[PDB]
Amino acid sequence: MVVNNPNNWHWVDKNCIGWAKEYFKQKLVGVEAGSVKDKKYAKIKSVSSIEGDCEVNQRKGKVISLFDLKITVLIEGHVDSKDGSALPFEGSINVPEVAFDSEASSYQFDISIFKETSELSEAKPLIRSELLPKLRQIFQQFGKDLLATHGNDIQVPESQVKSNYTRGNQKPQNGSGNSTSIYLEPTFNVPSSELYETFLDKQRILAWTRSAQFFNSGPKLETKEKFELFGGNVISELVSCEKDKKLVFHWKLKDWSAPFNSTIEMTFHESQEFHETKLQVKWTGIPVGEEDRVRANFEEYYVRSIKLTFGFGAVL
Amino acid sequence: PQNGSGNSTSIYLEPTFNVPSSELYETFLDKQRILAWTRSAQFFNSGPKLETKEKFELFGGNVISELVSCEKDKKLVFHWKLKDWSAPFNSTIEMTFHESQEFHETKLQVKWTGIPVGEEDRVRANFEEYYVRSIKLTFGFGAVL
Amino acid sequence: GETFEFQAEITQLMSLIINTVYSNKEIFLRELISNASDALDKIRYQALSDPKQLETEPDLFIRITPKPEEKVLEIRDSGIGMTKAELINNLGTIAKSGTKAFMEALSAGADVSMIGQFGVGFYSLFLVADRVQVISKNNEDEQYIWESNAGGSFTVTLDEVNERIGRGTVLRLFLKDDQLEYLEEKRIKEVIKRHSEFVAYPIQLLVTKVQELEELNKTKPLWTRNPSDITQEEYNAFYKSISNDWEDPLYVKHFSVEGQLEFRAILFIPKRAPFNNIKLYVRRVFITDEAEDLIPEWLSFVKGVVDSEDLPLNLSREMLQQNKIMKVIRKNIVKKLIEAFNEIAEDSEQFDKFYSAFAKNIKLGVHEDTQNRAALAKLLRYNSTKSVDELTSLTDYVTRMPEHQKNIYYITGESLKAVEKSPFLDALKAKNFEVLFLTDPIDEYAFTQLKEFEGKTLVDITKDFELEETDEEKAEREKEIKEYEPLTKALKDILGDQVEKVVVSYKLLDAPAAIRTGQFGWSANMERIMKAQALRSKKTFEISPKSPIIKELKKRVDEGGAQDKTVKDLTNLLFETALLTSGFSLEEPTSFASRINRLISLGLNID
Amino acid sequence: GETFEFQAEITQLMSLIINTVYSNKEIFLRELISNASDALDKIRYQALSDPKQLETEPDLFIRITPKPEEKVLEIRDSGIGMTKAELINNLGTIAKSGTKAFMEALSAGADVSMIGQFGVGFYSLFLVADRVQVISKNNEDEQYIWESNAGGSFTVTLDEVNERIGRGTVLRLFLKDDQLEYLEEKRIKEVIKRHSEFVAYPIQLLVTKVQELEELNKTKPLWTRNPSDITQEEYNAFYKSISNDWEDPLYVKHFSVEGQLEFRAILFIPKRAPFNNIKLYVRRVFITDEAEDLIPEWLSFVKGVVDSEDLPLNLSREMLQQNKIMKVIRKNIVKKLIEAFNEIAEDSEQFDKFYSAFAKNIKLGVHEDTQNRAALAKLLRYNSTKSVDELTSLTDYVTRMPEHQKNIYYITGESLKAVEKSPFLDALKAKNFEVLFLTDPIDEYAFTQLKEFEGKTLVDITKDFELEETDEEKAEREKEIKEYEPLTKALKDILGDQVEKVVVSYKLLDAPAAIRTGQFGWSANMERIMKAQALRSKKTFEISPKSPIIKELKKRVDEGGAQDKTVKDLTNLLFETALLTSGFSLEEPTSFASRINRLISLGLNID
Numbered sequence A: 001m002v003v004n005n006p007n008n009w010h011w012v013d014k015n016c017i018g019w020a021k022e023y024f025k026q027k028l029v030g031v032e033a034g035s036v037k038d039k040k041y042a043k044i045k046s047v048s049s050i051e052g053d054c055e056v057n058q059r060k061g062k063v064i065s066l067f068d069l070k071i072t073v074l075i076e077g078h079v080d081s082k083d084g085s086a087l088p089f090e091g092s093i094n095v096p097e098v099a100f101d102s103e104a105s106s107y108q109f110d111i112s113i114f115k116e117t118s119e120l121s122e123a124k125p126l127i128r129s130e131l132l133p134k135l136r137q138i139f140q141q142f143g144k145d146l147l148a149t150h151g152n153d154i155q156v157p158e159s160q161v162k163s164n165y166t167r168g169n170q171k172p173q174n175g176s177g178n179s180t181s182i183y184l185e186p187t188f189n190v191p192s193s194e195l196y197e198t199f200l201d202k203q204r205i206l207a208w209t210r211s212a213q214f215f216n217s218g219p220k221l222e223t224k225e226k227f228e229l230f231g232g233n234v235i236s237e238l239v240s241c242e243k244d245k246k247l248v249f250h251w252k253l254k255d256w257s258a259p260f261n262s263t264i265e266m267t268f269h270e271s272q273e274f275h276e277t278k279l280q281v282k283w284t285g286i287p288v289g290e291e292d293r294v295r296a297n298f299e300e301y302y303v304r305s306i307k308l309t310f311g312f313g314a315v316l
Numbered sequence B: 001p002q003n004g005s006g007n008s009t010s011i012y013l014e015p016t017f018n019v020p021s022s023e024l025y026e027t028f029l030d031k032q033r034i035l036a037w038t039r040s041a042q043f044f045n046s047g048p049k050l051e052t053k054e055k056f057e058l059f060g061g062n063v064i065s066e067l068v069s070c071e072k073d074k075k076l077v078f079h080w081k082l083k084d085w086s087a088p089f090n091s092t093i094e095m096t097f098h099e100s101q102e103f104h105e106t107k108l109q110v111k112w113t114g115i116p117v118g119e120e121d122r123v124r125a126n127f128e129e130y131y132v133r134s135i136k137l138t139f140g141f142g143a144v145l
Numbered sequence C, D: 001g002e003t004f005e006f007q008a009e010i011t012q013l014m015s016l017i018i019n020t021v022y023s024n025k026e027i028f029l030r031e032l033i034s035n036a037s038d039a040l041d042k043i044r045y046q047a048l049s050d051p052k053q054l055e056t057e058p059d060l061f062i063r064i065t066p067k068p069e070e071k072v073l074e075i076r077d078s079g080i081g082m083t084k085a086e087l088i089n090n091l092g093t094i095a096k097s098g099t100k101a102f103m104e105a106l107s108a109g110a111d112v113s114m115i116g117q118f119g120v121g122f123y124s125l126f127l128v129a130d131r132v133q134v135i136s137k138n139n140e141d142e143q144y145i146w147e148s149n150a151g152g153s154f155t156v157t158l159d160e161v162n163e164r165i166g167r168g169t170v171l172r173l174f175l176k177d178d179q180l181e182y183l184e185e186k187r188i189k190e191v192i193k194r195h196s197e198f199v200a201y202p203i204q205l206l207v208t209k210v211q212e213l214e215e216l217n218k219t220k221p222l223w224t225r226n227p228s229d230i231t232q233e234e235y236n237a238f239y240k241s242i243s244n245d246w247e248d249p250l251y252v253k254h255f256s257v258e259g260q261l262e263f264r265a266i267l268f269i270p271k272r273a274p275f276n277n278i279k280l281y282v283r284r285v286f287i288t289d290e291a292e293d294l295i296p297e298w299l300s301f302v303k304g305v306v307d308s309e310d311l312p313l314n315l316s317r318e319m320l321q322q323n324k325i326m327k328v329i330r331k332n333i334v335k336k337l338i339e340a341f342n343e344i345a346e347d348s349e350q351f352d353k354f355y356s357a358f359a360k361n362i363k364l365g366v367h368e369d370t371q372n373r374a375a376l377a378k379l380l381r382y383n384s385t386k387s388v389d390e391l392t393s394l395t396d397y398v399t400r401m402p403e404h405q406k407n408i409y410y411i412t413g414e415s416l417k418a419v420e421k422s423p424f425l426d427a428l429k430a431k432n433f434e435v436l437f438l439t440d441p442i443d444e445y446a447f448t449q450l451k452e453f454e455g456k457t458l459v460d461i462t463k464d465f466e467l468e469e470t471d472e473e474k475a476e477r478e479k480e481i482k483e484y485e486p487l488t489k490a491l492k493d494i495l496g497d498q499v500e501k502v503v504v505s506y507k508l509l510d511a512p513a514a515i516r517t518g519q520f521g522w523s524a525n526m527e528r529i530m531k532a533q534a535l536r537s538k539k540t541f542e543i544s545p546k547s548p549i550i551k552e553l554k555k556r557v558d559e560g561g562a563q564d565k566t567v568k569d570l571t572n573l574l575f576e577t578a579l580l581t582s583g584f585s586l587e588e589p590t591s592f593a594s595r596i597n598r599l600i601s602l603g604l605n606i607d
Ligand SMILES: Nc1ncnc2c1ncn2[C@@H]1O[C@H](COP(=O)(O)OP(=O)(O)OP(O)(O)=S)[C@@H](O)[C@H]1O
Pocket: C031, C035, C036, C039, C077, C079, C080, C081, C082, C090, C091, C096, C097, C098, C099, C100, C115, C116, C117, C118, C119, C120, C121, C122, C123, C168, C169
């Protein structure tokens, strides 16, 4: 790109989070450990998510990168079996952080094998034998290729730089828009039995909302039933619901137009080990310029309002 | 022009405490009570309470104070000096009590003189932390929010 | 001595206005939309004197067309446009503002308020673009092209290859490789909603569904209109635009101050507490909302915006410099909101929802603010023995005060049921004295700072206090206290340091004993509050000489039962029982339960 | 077609650089001292190669002489000075930085840390001065005078009416009528103690007592030195300079990161909580202290400063760009502080003062921070049944856990005396199970987020939980629960909706009954905490089958006493008594006190 920095003295930043994702999608995949003919085998098939920061900066001619990415990938393969042929399995590898000054022994790997059992004990030493050393050399080489590819995009060539200091440091009609979708997982300290009736019992709904207008005389919410919340500004309709497992609502704001109507999908993931419940909310149909508004208010009128009225978790 | 030090200044505060003047006067003199709201006090004499012309170090020895004049629940004059201050600088803090029987309060008019020019804002903010709010939270002589 | 002139290093000054002139990079869109609104104001001012100027392109709009295939962000406006000379002087000279030069050439008393005053706002687009292709078209000139690559030179070429436009200016922003986020529908609507959401002219966005045009600024600003012509529905829609709240505003306070500090401000009071909130606008442009001296801390719940005009902005137009003027707007906001709160108090239904939702905020101002402490005390509402059903104010309290009452009596506690059945009310109810009820933890913090209301001193009945008494009772009480002197000395020796003193009190009727603070220390509720805060006194033993239990204990003392085992057990039992009624917490509650268990066994004939 | 060059409007650029760049007007002193330090670095760099350049003025000082009678603030430095051409090229041209050009002339790897890089910092003095009379003197030139008044022109005249100086530059500032505050001693020392405190060269100030010279920068920077050569007394004086605290720092953490990101930081842990704090310095000059992405909120108690010599600075040089460098420094500061906290944990006398003073801050990290939640969990220190003397850690807890224990048992409450005598400890003490004691209100907020320590699940004994016993005991307990089934049904009908269910529990040995939560909701202590905050659950009736009182109540049920008046009185008595032991708030204590007064009257033979 065109960078107007005489002698490369000012801080010019160039974000590379997009190229970083494309880099690992061409380097992490296809990496296998062992062989297909062998009794144990593992190979990465795809990258789950790449979140963090990846940016290159220059101050006085030195290409500086302070990237920090949390990489998660999915792996497949098979292990040895006592009876019959080999048994396939699936897993995932979680890396805490990939910094710029990380050493070979600094990279950590959280082993997450699906369907754990006693027969898959040789799954962890398998990836730690050949798969992990292959991931270490890629992460160490990621910093070198990043400075060599995007480093030349900044720091204009020395033929135009008259500074020996910085040189020594270089090496249609009117309508509306489309919709979108968000995903959040608020944690509640309440079993799915009481949390399910919280969104259905009209007596309990009025508690954490303090404003509701039910059109039917039913005790609790039923399928294909409309009701207005917050002075009639929030219009929701229960169209599908499972027993303490699924909740589907047709959320709609009064400010929205007619061709816009969102859908909330709530899934219960109560875990008796810690006595809590993770309510995975798959919210789709929100307008593009409205996803941040409904998400910030959902953590105020739905998440915190229930945890403070009924006490389903302490917040501070 | 030679190498020396600057001039001095003076401040004035009126922290309101919910405590009778009799109990608040004993707070700044009783060594057992001083160690409570100060958390660090070093007394050199075996006396139970503070007397005139008696030096004592507070807050690990960084604050050197000395009672030079005091009246019965009416006046408290101390010579206040910090450890990082130079030798010529030596501040004098006066405490005047005003007990109000209508509101059950005591306005402690503090007339503090002899403070260095650069050390003006430092001794004022920390006074509300180590002297005003410390006593209100240790003995319950005032609501702090 | 020779007199030279100041120069400018173009090769280095441009870098100062391209690299480090804007903390954030999304500012380029705001300063380009603001430049488009200024051009629309110029052609609108000329249309009033010459209708032929607005005949080429009569529709005034601001169109944004993102192109992800070739990485071009097109921003088209139908303003006055720029000639060939204006592209060299107004768009080719640093710190040269043609808009400000147009404002100084207007007439006296103009109704147009343009934004461009500095002259370096156009160079913001280079933060995200490497080269810009400006296509301008004026009425008195041809269509030209202004191309530059953020360096030290630019090219002005006659337009002969692009589409012919009627009037205005088209900006083609070739975005960089890392700044491709501004080609999406999300980032475009995010910057406009944050910065240029209140543009007087409609902002059109070309969204790919087939492609359509959507107006980003749907809610027109209301601060440029009279508050009498604005209806209630317009205030509700305006509140849902300045804030992400879903509910309608409870009260709207729209005022206008004139003179040397002409500024508009529409302040909204929500129905629910948001637990900044007041945004600042200059020339219909959002500057910042991080002003901490504009609104007090206890008053930070009020929503709305403040559109001022005489504010010294920096080169980035996103923060304010110290000018000692924000304190003037601060006191005007508080003065209008206090006046607005008094208007809410005129109605019963409106103030009931306001007080129940912001009880902590109003009482916090009495503790924090001092200049308007008396005005905030007028809004304080609490329950009492004569107002158990509804809420009453402090003024209505003094109205119902008898002639022989000189102090406002109140009591604090945890809940309403605890203070309503408190044994401290029996004394004041006999004298026909109303006692307020304090249920919120912040109540005591407000009463400890007010200290007086209309000459009446605030006195807590939980602490030690003195009431009026007749001459016949004054002499009778002194005789009875002297007779019960050995009983008080016996209870003092049993409890030890648990109480400060044991005295005979006549302010108790049914309860045989009670505990008071001492009118100088922290109350039983205040001590419980401080010992229960997540982010963070002596006792007086008073007995009732008319209770049958106390009279039985008096008979034991005269018979030599000062050191009896049964007397000491009932003494510690009655003392810890009074702590539950006075609001104190029992230390080691297991020992207190053991005394109750032995009483139940005694009642069940257990040996 | 036509290619032009970017120009600049000098008559308007001067007003923008001076008035609409810096937020405060005191910033002018920071740049003039920084330019004085840069000139001193230039002559010092030449003294190493030519000692004759330092013979005209060997003392490298910065002298400030205010004149209230003449309204003149003189700032004299002994730097390299400026020649006749430098006063016109460097000082006369806007954005022209000769200091930056001097840094570009030398080779990469020098020991120069000059400050001037932009070239518009000199014009800041016009915010407070009407006209300037800067006098310069160089070794290879004569003494000249640079006069200007920000009017678009300056004058360079040979000096013949001023005192002859050896080498340096004298800055004569004719302050305005409204900016005369910079002529006193308080304002000058305030700006120096805020922006130019850690200048390597001594800053002299001419104060009027006879007039003397006082060195304002008495504490030299310690980050320019190795942490091994610095003693303990130097860290104490350095802490008293960065902050206004009087006491010595409890712990010092001095580290330095050398590599792609070169920044040094000296972090101090105070002895008392200050209830920002970490200042940022670039080129040994204060930039800002209100950074939010530098240090977390729960960790903001740590004092100190951070030297970040190379950073993207703003045009005003008091704010950082959106460059993602703050997050890199954020994780390094937390990593070094957690490592520092572990070094404090190695000691016994020092960690006692640290934990007792910052108990809330450490536990807030477990509640807020998630990436470093396991590292902070090992620093938590509480009391237990086996550690009543001193505080024990979670690691030492697992070490003393028997082989048949699989969960970490704890209990929260109001104070330590209440949790040590709670009836919930009798079950765990029989099985030799250690139970932690939680006395702070923030303790529950931390345990509700960790949920696991080294595979051990955190279980609160206050809530309903299940213990592991043999199969033979489960058989005999099921018979006793089935036998006491009508007893539990009788207690449920009397209390009504006060409890969720009445079950026979074997976790009680001496107490007759207790109250537990339903494993979901707010605990007994948590519910009391939330209902007592100023700025802001169903119950289970468990009875003990081995208590004599419960056995007597069982005999009454078999005799038809399910609706007896005496049974219902003792039923509500045991329930309201168990609420006091379990930590619940008692409703309407007057009714509970009336039951005690009737029991005392019964014991005193009162009919
Ligand atoms: N879209 C446009 N259409 C017509 N004229 C324009 C347009 N953009 C800029 N100009 C002209 O260019 C001049 C310089 O604009 P800018 O460089 O943005 O500075 P400014 O807008 O005058 O002041 P600021 O810095 O934005 S407050 C304006 O005064 C207009 O005369």
